[PDB]
Amino acid sequence: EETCFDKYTGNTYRVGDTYERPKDSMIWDCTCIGAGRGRISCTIANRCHEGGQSYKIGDTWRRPHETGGYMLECVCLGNGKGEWTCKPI
């Protein structure tokens, strides 16, 4: 049966398996497609890489406002663009 090998995780996957890959300071959502050539598809469209962290859609977090001296609350939206929102709290 057909497999993919991911050199970043070091693991072997079956077609349709989904997993996380650490690459270029980000976490990618990957899927083993195979297609006769161990084809893997990886995306960061559905994650929010803010502040050096990696969040999933619906995650919320807090981060300091640069200069204001208060915190922000942020929410990961994704929208196919790795997009998030922040507001003062």
């Binding site: 297609a35 050539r37 161990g38 084809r39 893997i40 598809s41 990886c42 995306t43 960061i44 469209a45 196919g80 663009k81 790795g82």
Partner: peptide, 14 residues
């Protein structure tokens, strides 16, 4: 720059 939000990889021809 982040020009695209995904990539595709497959086995090298060699």
């Amino acid at each position: 720059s982040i020009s695209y939000t995904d990539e595709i990889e497959e086995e090298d021809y060699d």
